[PDB]
């Protein structure tokens, strides 16, 4: 409750709301262009949006105004991304971007916000990071259910938009720094996650690694 937290908080805090209201409309989204899995996607989206009220409590609870102009605009260059993928019916490039890159970013950052959230804000992110597990979890059944039709899509999906995140946790790196996150957590954490998941889906550990170096 500090000068200085509290700042930092305005623009995070935005971040993550801005991150969920976004990753609710994507799950809709997604919703009609793959119709035969269409309610455990739509319960993926309305569950995104208890967390949106959950982190908007987290807010408040310390008092702070979020910049949601900052967050729409920290976000601007994905969402644009997916929209024109969703436009194209190119449903790998949504998952791609929403459930790979987008919920190993959550995971990533809050497992990180945790140990050093103060005590109200710990309990709700515990609660999110549990559903964020779930949801990277489906994008990664579609796509290696589907590896070898989406392959060559994927590939292309990830240097478009892998890039774009690394501009975005290089933005937070600051505002992260005042809030305990140290900045090696994050970049190492999210790394080794979105490995993982392209090793989960198909994807050999050469191929991975090839595909990191978009950044
Ligand atoms: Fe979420
Ligand atoms: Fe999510």
Same mark, same amino acid.
């Given at each position: ?17 801005? $991150?969920?209201?976004?990753?609710? #409309?994507?799950?809709?989204? /997604? ?13 993926? %989206? ?7 009220? $959950?982190?908007?409590? @987290? +807010? ?19 969402? &644009?991304?997916? !929209? %024109?993928?969703?436009?194209?019916? !190119?449903?790998? *490039? @949504?998952? /791609? ?5 987008? =919920? @190993?970013?959550?995971? %990533? ?11 109200? %804000? ?9 559903? =964020? ?5 489906? $994008? ?30 290089? &933005?937070?790196? #600051? #505002?992260?720094? &005042? ?15 979105? +490995?993982?998941?392209? &090793?989960?889906? +198909?994807? *050999? *550990? ?10």
């Amino acid at each position: 409750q500090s000068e200085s937290y509290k700042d930092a908080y305005s623009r995070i805090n935005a971040i993550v709301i801005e $991150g969920e209201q976004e990753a609710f #409309d994507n799950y809709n989204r /997604l919703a009609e262009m793959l119709p035969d899995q269409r309610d455990e996607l739509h319960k993926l %989206a309305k569950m995104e949006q208890r967390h949106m009220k $959950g982190f908007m409590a @987290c +807010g408040k609870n310390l008092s702070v105004t979020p910049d949601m102009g900052f967050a729409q605009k920290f976000f601007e260059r994905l969402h &644009e991304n997916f !929209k %024109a993928a969703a436009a194209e019916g !190119k449903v790998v *490039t @949504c998952l /791609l971007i929403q459930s790979l890159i987008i =919920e @190993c970013f959550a995971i %990533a950052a809050f497992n990180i916000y945790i140990p050093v959230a103060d005590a109200f %804000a710990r309990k709700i992110t515990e609660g999110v990071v549990r559903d =964020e597990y779930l949801h990277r979890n489906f $994008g990664e059944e579609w796509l290696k259910a589907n590896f070898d039709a989406s392959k060559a899509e994927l590939e292309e999906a990830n240097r478009q938009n892998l890039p774009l995140v690394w501009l975005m946790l290089n &933005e937070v790196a #600051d #505002d992260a720094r &005042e809030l305990g996150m140290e900045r090696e957590s994050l970049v190492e954490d999210f790394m080794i996650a979105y +490995g993982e998941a392209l &090793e989960n889906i +198909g994807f *050999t *550990t050469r191929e991975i690694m090839r595909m990191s170096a978009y950044g």
